[PDB]
Amino acid sequence: DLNVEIVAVERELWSGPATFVFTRTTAGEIGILPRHIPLVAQLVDDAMVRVEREGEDDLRIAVDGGFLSVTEETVRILVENAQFESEIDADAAKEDAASDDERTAAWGRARLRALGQI
Amino acid sequence: LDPNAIITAGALIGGGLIMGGGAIGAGIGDGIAGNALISGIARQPEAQGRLFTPFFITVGLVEAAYFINLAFMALFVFATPGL
Amino acid sequence: DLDPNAIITAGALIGGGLIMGGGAIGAGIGDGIAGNALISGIARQPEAQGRLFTPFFITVGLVEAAYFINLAFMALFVFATPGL
Amino acid sequence: LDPNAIITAGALIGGGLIMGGGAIGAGIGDGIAGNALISGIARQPEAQGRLFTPFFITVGLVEAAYFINLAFMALFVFATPGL
Amino acid sequence: LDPNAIITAGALIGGGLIMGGGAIGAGIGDGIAGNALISGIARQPEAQGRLFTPFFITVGLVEAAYFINLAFMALFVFATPGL
Amino acid sequence: LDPNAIITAGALIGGGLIMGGGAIGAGIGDGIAGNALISGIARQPEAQGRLFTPFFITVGLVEAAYFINLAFMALFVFATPGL
Amino acid sequence: DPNAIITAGALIGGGLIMGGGAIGAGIGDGIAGNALISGIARQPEAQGRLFTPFFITVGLVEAAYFINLAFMALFVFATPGL
Amino acid sequence: DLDPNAIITAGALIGGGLIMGGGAIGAGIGDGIAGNALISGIARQPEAQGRLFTPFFITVGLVEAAYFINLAFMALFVFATPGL
Amino acid sequence: LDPNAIITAGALIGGGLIMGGGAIGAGIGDGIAGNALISGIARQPEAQGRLFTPFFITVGLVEAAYFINLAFMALFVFATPGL
Amino acid sequence: LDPNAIITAGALIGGGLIMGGGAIGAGIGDGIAGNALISGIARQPEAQGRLFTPFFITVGLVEAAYFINLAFMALFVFATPGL
Amino acid sequence: MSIFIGQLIGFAVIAFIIVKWVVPPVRTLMRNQQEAVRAALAESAEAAKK
Amino acid sequence: AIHVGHHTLVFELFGMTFNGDTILATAVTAVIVIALAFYLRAKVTSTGVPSGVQLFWEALTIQMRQQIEGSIGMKIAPFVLPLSVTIFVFILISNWLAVLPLQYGGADGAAAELYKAPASDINFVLALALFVFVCYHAAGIWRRGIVGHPIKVVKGHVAFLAPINIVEELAKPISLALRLFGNIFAGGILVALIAMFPWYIQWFPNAVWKTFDLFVGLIQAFIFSLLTILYFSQSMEL
Amino acid sequence: SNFLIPNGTFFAVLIIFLIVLGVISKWVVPPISKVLAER
């Protein structure tokens, strides 16, 4: 078990134990387990983070500007913005997707991936 | 000297070399593919389900050459050309 | 003492054996290397798979090319031994 | 000159080639797969359960070829065609 | 014993060596060049256009060596010097 | 030209090939597994205790692949079949 | 004829020599190309600057290959001690 | 009518040559690979060299063991060929 | 049979083995060193001056081995021991 | 038929194999160690001095194998056992 | 003696190369070590005075 | 005309043979080492500026102490430092003197060297390797008793790979010896081989090869010293 | 020839090596170690 802490510039977003942490980095997809070696990585523009805990359903978060840092004791994602799956809006995510603005399109794609529509 | 004896000895040596090369290539290719699969799984343990397929494609590609060499060696040892 | 045909046939069989030994080793190595590249590619970017087979098959076909070409020379040796 | 003499000499050389190629293939595949396994275990200790199995698949895929070479040496050294 | 038979056998063995070396080099050099190009394309989805050129240069050098070996083997087998 | 001498020479050449291949495989596999172990421990100084296990498994596998050769080479030299 | 045996041995030696030379040249070219592909993938503008080290490597490998070729020619065309 | 023992000696010599040539190839490659690992580790972790020497040689000895075993059997073949 | 012909053929084949091994070793080592240099240049274009010196050291060692093999081949061919 | 010629040719072939193996091993090891040194230099320019000493140990091992070859080839060709 | 003359010429060439190239840097390192130890001694003296 | 072996000045005493030339070379190296040691002792200036000899010796000592500490505690076995440091210098000069131009014509149409590196003879390397073997095995016996040492080495890292461990032990001395021999023996051959060419063209290859040989010898001596230290450490633990 | 056969030199050379060690174990290594520790 590893202590995840999704922290954002405006405020910290989520913190707590989790068994698995899946995401997509510039290098590629990465799945972090409790004793993962120390690492620093940059998430892709439309990255999504799936944290899998015990006793609860897996949690999907859409991240803008996330940077992953994995340590022997704890893991922290420095996210410019982060939204939980429960509050994601399907129509808004679709409309934001494929926008001429790369930032908006990436945010919409991250929202969809967190939801699952991709 | 018996022509058949020399011809068959040459055929046996050639087939042995055929198997030597085929085994070398197949084994090292299989090891390389397994290394790629292991690295991928370590990167993302849940990715094995989708990783198996390309790995099996590579294994097919290498094992095909291996068994082609098997067939040609079998031709050599049993059906010796120009015997 | 020895008939020319026996000696030339033994030489041809050994030569063809070398042909396909080298061809098999090279084909196995190339296939393994291309497969490693592809395996890592899908392990990292599953979405890239469609654009990834193209160079993969392009290189694997080239790897095979030499090994399959060796078939013609092997046949010319074992079955059509020049100057038999 | 005894034809069986040349037959046996050629068979021995062929079997030597068999063992050569088989040993290169087996050792190289084992080394590459082991390097992948070491890297994966170092990176993800808890992934050993899901990492040993693919490592076993690939090492089996390499051994299979090596043991096939051993079996064919058995033929070359005990039942050589044309003896 | 006929000298021509021995000369032809030696030439055929030499050609076998030529082809073995050429196949080894061509196949595995092209395989590694591939691996490089596929890795680059995976990293860069649209870099293939700007990547094919160096890859084609590499495979061109490799296949130039391979076909040089092919031509030399043809020369020895069909135009065996000192027959 | 005593035949038994020819069979013994063929067996000796077979042993040459067998042990050359076994040594190549053992050296390469040991070196690769090493490289992996050194890299892993360099990343994690404390992990060496657990990384030794897979490393020693692979080392044992490759050394067994070499010892199988060793035994069959002994068979070739100690008790040459078809003598 | 002893001269026939000498010629056969020389031809086998030349065949082996050029087999080794082809192996070396092909693999060296492939490795250098692998490095060049990686570099160009990292930065397209790097293509111009990467040529000089890549050319140095491929030339220094093909030099060994061509020296090997010259030695094979020496063996085959001029069989020493015939 | 040539000496059979001369043929046996030539065969043993070629065999032992293969023995220790393969041994040397294996030893050189393995030592080089372990050395590359050691260089990479030392570059990554400067102070680590002290503790990384022992794992390095844990594999260097393992690699050289096969080489020297093959060397011993080469001497066995050459010094006293089996059933000369 | 003339002893000189057998000795000369053996010397020719031995020198050919020497050149084989030398060519493989030199080509592979030089290619690997050049690959390292290319990687360094691509990752650090301005480091070329610093990187050249290890390149030349490795080239010196590799070419020293190759030319040593060349010298022994010259010995074997022109001045065969026990000719 | 002058067994001296047979033994001399066998010794020459053996020595050719000695040099083949030694040259291959030395070239590959030198290339690999040089690549590691160049990569270390490129990544950490500060470690010039530190990275040199392990590199020379690695060169020592590889050249040790290669020069052990040299020695045994000198033994075979000049003072051939079993003459 | 012809081989002797050639070997003497080779020895002279290598001596020239080494004296030209490697002697200056090794002398520089020797001088640097001497100056470093002398500076350490002076530092000890001045620290005792301090 | 290489004439590999054929040691000159061979003489038989006590009903057994000795190679005079190798003993001469070894004695020359030993007296050079003794002269340097006496120069150091006479001109050892701790407070003053060290001389070239002092700088050389102290650099050797500090480097070797660094490797020893990196391997095992200096206080655990201080004797390792003097025991094997000599091996560095003893070998070094033995190879370095090969640069000196002592190669002439023996009137037999070949090349003969007045001075031949002692490591170029199998006896020298055999003696050094066997001495090191007995030395570090005795050190291990002292560390973990006579009975414990064989059990420890046989057990090794993993029990089920016991045979290799024994080979490793037997590999320790031979590995040390042969390489050294080769690293020097080739040189002895090469120069002689280089003598085959005409002098007006044989000069340059001889110069280049001797330049390379200087390195070969220095690096080989460093490797021998570090391997000695390591083998002392490995046999000395727990 | 077989130069590899051990010879008497093995013993004789060993003796010289030994004395050198004896010289370096008392008049070089201990004094220089003392100097280094003093520095």
Side-chain angles (χ1 to χ4, degrees):
Chain A
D1 195 32
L2 61 83
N3 310 333
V4 189
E5 265 166 355
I6 288 163
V7 185
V9 60
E10 297 220 340
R11 78 194 176 154
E12 175 274 315
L13 264 292
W14 196 91
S15 178
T19 66
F20 190 44
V21 166
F22 159 88
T23 178
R24 203 170 153 206
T25 75
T26 45
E29 301 207 338
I30 184 171
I32 295 92
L33 270 299
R35 279 179 282 158
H36 190 296
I37 53 162
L39 170 62
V40 179
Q42 155 163 12
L43 273 63
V44 70
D45 60 2
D46 69 277
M48 183 278 288
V49 185
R50 168 156 48 69
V51 194
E52 323 190 5
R53 298 72 46 95
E54 56 277 48
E56 266 88 4
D57 187 359
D58 303 327
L59 197 149
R60 298 153 78 69
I61 281 155
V63 168
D64 291 331
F67 290 155
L68 166 64
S69 170
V70 183
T71 314
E72 165 57 16
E73 50 270 25
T74 59
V75 184
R76 264 184 312 263
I77 306 173
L78 290 68
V79 306
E80 269 188 332
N81 179 19
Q83 162 160 23
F84 279 38
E85 190 188 355
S86 59
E87 309 93 308
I88 307 191
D89 186 78
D91 188 358
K94 297 296 289 183
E95 291 298 325
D96 291 331
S99 72
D100 293 290
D101 206 345
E102 70 93 28
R103 280 197 63 85
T104 291
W107 180 216
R109 281 200 314 279
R111 298 233 296 282
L112 295 148
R113 280 168 65 88
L115 279 177
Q117 277 90 33
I118 301 165
Chain B
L1 271 289
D2 196 48
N4 264 11
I6 175 163
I7 297 156
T8 48
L12 272 296
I13 290 160
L17 188 153
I18 291 283
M19 294 297 102
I24 288 164
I28 63 181
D30 298 335
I32 290 281
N35 169 9
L37 172 70
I38 285 278
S39 63
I41 291 168
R43 209 154 153 74
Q44 207 275 2
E46 278 62 1
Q48 79 285 38
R50 66 142 180 282
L51 282 167
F52 273 39
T53 292
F55 167 72
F56 284 141
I57 295 287
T58 300
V59 175
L61 282 146
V62 296
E63 200 184 0
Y66 193 43
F67 278 61
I68 291 152
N69 293 112
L70 271 292
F72 267 93
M73 183 278 288
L75 178 137
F76 271 114
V77 305
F78 307 113
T80 316
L83 185 60
Chain C
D1 283 328
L2 274 296
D3 52 337
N5 284 329
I7 276 159
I8 186 54
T9 52
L13 271 73
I14 299 291
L18 276 71
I19 307 298
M20 294 296 172
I25 290 163
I29 292 163
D31 291 356
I33 295 296
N36 180 350
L38 185 135
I39 286 282
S40 182
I42 297 89
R44 297 216 200 198
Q45 304 151 270
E47 66 278 351
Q49 173 163 341
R51 92 207 179 209
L52 195 72
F53 289 107
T54 284
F56 163 82
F57 277 135
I58 285 161
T59 186
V60 173
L62 183 63
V63 175
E64 300 309 327
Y67 165 57
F68 272 128
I69 280 156
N70 263 349
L71 273 298
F73 298 111
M74 193 210 187
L76 180 138
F77 276 40
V78 304
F79 298 130
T81 313
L84 186 137
Chain D
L1 272 289
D2 175 20
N4 290 318
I6 279 157
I7 297 278
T8 43
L12 268 290
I13 289 160
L17 291 162
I18 299 305
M19 294 299 291
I24 294 90
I28 303 280
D30 298 343
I32 295 284
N35 166 15
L37 186 84
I38 297 297
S39 296
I41 293 289
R43 197 179 158 178
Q44 307 215 339
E46 289 90 8
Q48 66 91 2
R50 304 171 201 184
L51 285 163
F52 273 107
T53 46
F55 171 84
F56 291 175
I57 301 299
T58 187
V59 302
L61 186 68
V62 161
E63 294 293 328
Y66 166 63
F67 279 37
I68 278 159
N69 285 75
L70 265 291
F72 281 44
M73 182 179 72
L75 187 153
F76 270 35
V77 302
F78 300 132
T80 315
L83 57 85
Chain E
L1 184 57
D2 189 356
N4 313 300
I6 282 164
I7 300 149
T8 45
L12 266 52
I13 296 289
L17 292 151
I18 296 290
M19 294 299 291
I24 294 292
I28 72 173
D30 285 311
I32 59 175
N35 169 16
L37 173 53
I38 296 89
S39 75
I41 289 165
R43 272 90 167 271
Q44 290 71 27
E46 293 83 3
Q48 52 191 334
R50 56 181 181 77
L51 278 172
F52 266 111
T53 287
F55 158 79
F56 278 127
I57 296 298
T58 301
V59 303
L61 302 185
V62 169
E63 293 305 298
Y66 183 61
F67 281 11
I68 276 161
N69 286 102
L70 296 193
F72 271 44
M73 183 278 288
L75 183 141
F76 293 103
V77 69
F78 304 124
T80 311
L83 192 147
Chain F
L1 281 298
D2 180 73
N4 308 67
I6 284 167
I7 297 89
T8 313
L12 293 159
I13 285 159
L17 292 165
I18 299 152
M19 288 293 99
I24 293 161
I28 307 279
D30 291 331
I32 297 281
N35 179 354
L37 180 84
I38 296 89
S39 286
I41 62 190
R43 269 205 274 92
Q44 267 184 328
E46 59 266 23
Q48 69 202 289
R50 62 158 204 279
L51 270 299
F52 280 21
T53 291
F55 159 87
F56 282 117
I57 292 288
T58 312
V59 162
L61 191 66
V62 61
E63 214 62 14
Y66 170 70
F67 279 22
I68 292 160
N69 275 41
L70 183 63
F72 281 104
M73 183 278 288
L75 182 151
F76 272 21
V77 299
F78 270 27
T80 303
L83 184 61
Chain G
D1 192 37
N3 279 312
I5 292 146
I6 292 158
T7 309
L11 260 66
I12 291 160
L16 173 64
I17 288 157
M18 294 299 291
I23 294 159
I27 306 165
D29 302 9
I31 278 165
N34 174 306
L36 183 82
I37 296 295
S38 77
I40 283 157
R42 294 299 87 69
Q43 283 88 17
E45 55 259 20
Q47 57 102 27
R49 64 170 187 267
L50 294 159
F51 291 137
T52 58
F54 158 84
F55 272 122
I56 289 160
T57 305
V58 300
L60 194 66
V61 166
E62 297 294 304
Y65 170 63
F66 290 134
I67 294 156
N68 182 288
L69 167 81
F71 280 115
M72 183 278 288
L74 179 145
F75 284 172
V76 300
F77 293 126
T79 58
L82 57 89
Chain H
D1 197 0
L2 59 87
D3 172 73
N5 270 323
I7 285 282
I8 290 142
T9 45
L13 260 55
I14 289 159
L18 294 174
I19 301 290
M20 184 278 287
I25 276 164
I29 309 290
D31 291 331
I33 294 290
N36 175 6
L38 180 66
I39 301 299
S40 78
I42 290 169
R44 174 173 304 173
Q45 197 172 23
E47 54 76 24
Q49 65 198 306
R51 83 192 183 72
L52 271 178
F53 271 113
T54 175
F56 181 76
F57 285 93
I58 278 168
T59 63
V60 161
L62 182 72
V63 160
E64 302 282 85
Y67 176 100
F68 297 132
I69 292 159
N70 293 112
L71 188 153
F73 292 99
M74 183 278 288
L76 187 148
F77 290 170
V78 179
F79 289 177
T81 306
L84 175 53
Chain I
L1 278 71
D2 196 5
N4 261 333
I6 289 159
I7 296 148
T8 313
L12 280 154
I13 297 159
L17 272 161
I18 289 156
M19 269 300 117
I24 297 89
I28 305 295
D30 189 358
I32 283 164
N35 161 26
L37 269 296
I38 285 280
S39 304
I41 292 287
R43 311 270 163 139
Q44 294 84 32
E46 69 275 16
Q48 62 190 359
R50 194 180 66 266
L51 297 174
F52 282 118
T53 297
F55 177 31
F56 304 145
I57 290 151
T58 311
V59 160
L61 295 176
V62 162
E63 295 295 328
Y66 183 58
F67 291 125
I68 290 152
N69 287 112
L70 173 149
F72 291 100
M73 185 193 72
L75 181 140
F76 280 28
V77 174
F78 305 134
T80 309
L83 183 67
Chain J
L1 276 59
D2 187 272
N4 293 302
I6 297 286
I7 182 56
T8 298
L12 281 156
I13 298 288
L17 288 166
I18 301 299
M19 294 298 102
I24 295 154
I28 295 309
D30 288 4
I32 296 282
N35 164 22
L37 178 70
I38 290 146
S39 290
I41 292 281
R43 301 283 160 67
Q44 309 81 6
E46 60 84 20
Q48 297 176 0
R50 172 159 37 82
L51 289 166
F52 265 50
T53 181
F55 164 64
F56 279 7
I57 300 309
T58 289
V59 161
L61 310 197
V62 305
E63 293 291 351
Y66 163 69
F67 280 106
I68 296 154
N69 290 19
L70 276 296
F72 292 167
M73 182 282 290
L75 180 136
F76 273 17
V77 303
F78 297 123
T80 306
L83 280 168
Chain K
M1 295 296 172
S2 85
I3 61 176
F4 187 87
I5 289 287
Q7 197 277 329
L8 288 175
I9 296 153
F11 181 72
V13 169
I14 59 177
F16 174 91
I17 293 287
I18 190 165
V19 300
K20 203 167 83 183
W21 279 22
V22 192
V23 165
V26 63
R27 263 176 173 170
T28 309
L29 290 143
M30 182 210 308
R31 294 282 160 78
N32 301 352
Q33 189 59 246
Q34 296 169 317
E35 294 305 324
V37 57
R38 185 225 48 66
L41 196 76
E43 207 76 53
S44 176
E46 68 85 17
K49 177 175 74 63
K50 286 284 189 301
Chain L
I2 192 80
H3 302 292
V4 162
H6 306 92
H7 278 100
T8 48
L9 321 186
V10 166
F11 39 72
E12 186 138 22
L13 281 73
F14 305 113
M16 183 278 288
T17 316
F18 312 78
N19 308 108
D21 61 358
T22 60
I23 285 282
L24 188 153
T26 295
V28 167
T29 295
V31 298
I32 299 297
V33 165
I34 294 302
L36 290 165
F38 277 26
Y39 194 110
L40 177 70
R41 164 155 276 291
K43 299 292 180 68
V44 62
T45 179
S46 170
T47 55
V49 298
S51 47
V53 178
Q54 189 165 340
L55 278 196
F56 175 64
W57 279 103
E58 78 182 5
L60 260 69
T61 316
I62 183 74
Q63 295 291 346
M64 210 171 165
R65 283 216 306 100
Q66 168 171 10
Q67 291 88 19
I68 295 153
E69 281 296 354
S71 78
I72 190 157
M74 176 78 201
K75 65 93 175 180
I76 298 285
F79 57 84
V80 172
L81 163 56
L83 176 45
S84 61
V85 63
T86 80
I87 302 169
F88 189 103
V89 292
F90 195 34
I91 299 164
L92 194 142
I93 299 294
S94 282
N95 314 141
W96 274 52
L97 299 170
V99 71
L100 310 179
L102 279 297
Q103 184 173 61
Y104 61 97
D108 61 2
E113 314 85 354
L114 173 52
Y115 163 79
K116 297 167 265 289
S120 80
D121 170 18
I122 186 67
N123 295 292
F124 174 89
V125 305
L126 267 168
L128 270 73
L130 293 172
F131 183 56
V132 168
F133 177 93
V134 60
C135 278
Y136 67 70
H137 264 276
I141 285 154
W142 154 90
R143 182 65 167 189
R144 64 174 68 90
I146 188 162
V147 304
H149 188 113
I151 307 306
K152 182 60 63 65
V153 301
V154 167
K155 284 202 164 56
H157 284 301
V158 297
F160 91 92
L161 300 179
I164 295 283
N165 309 144
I166 297 89
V167 167
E168 203 274 318
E169 292 276 346
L170 315 191
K172 284 189 201 291
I174 185 69
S175 77
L176 274 156
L178 304 179
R179 91 181 69 232
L180 166 56
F181 180 39
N183 296 115
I184 311 312
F185 185 28
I189 296 153
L190 269 297
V191 296
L193 197 150
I194 293 150
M196 295 296 172
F197 277 43
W199 86 91
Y200 78 100
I201 288 159
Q202 170 270 342
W203 62 290
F204 153 85
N206 169 275
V208 177
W209 171 249
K210 292 170 89 71
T211 312
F212 195 85
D213 195 357
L214 276 163
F215 293 92
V216 166
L218 180 62
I219 294 89
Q220 188 275 331
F222 182 76
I223 299 149
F224 209 84
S225 312
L226 264 73
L227 295 163
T228 309
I229 299 156
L230 180 65
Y231 293 137
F232 272 111
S233 312
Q234 172 44 44
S235 166
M236 185 180 288
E237 52 81 24
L238 200 153
Chain M
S1 307
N2 192 347
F3 50 79
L4 287 188
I5 63 189
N7 204 335
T9 303
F10 152 79
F11 277 114
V13 159
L14 186 149
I15 301 299
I16 297 89
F17 182 49
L18 274 169
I19 62 153
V20 178
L21 167 54
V23 164
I24 301 294
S25 298
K26 257 63 163 192
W27 302 343
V28 171
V29 162
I32 203 162
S33 177
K34 172 58 62 52
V35 167
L36 192 60
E38 171 262 322
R39 292 178 66 189

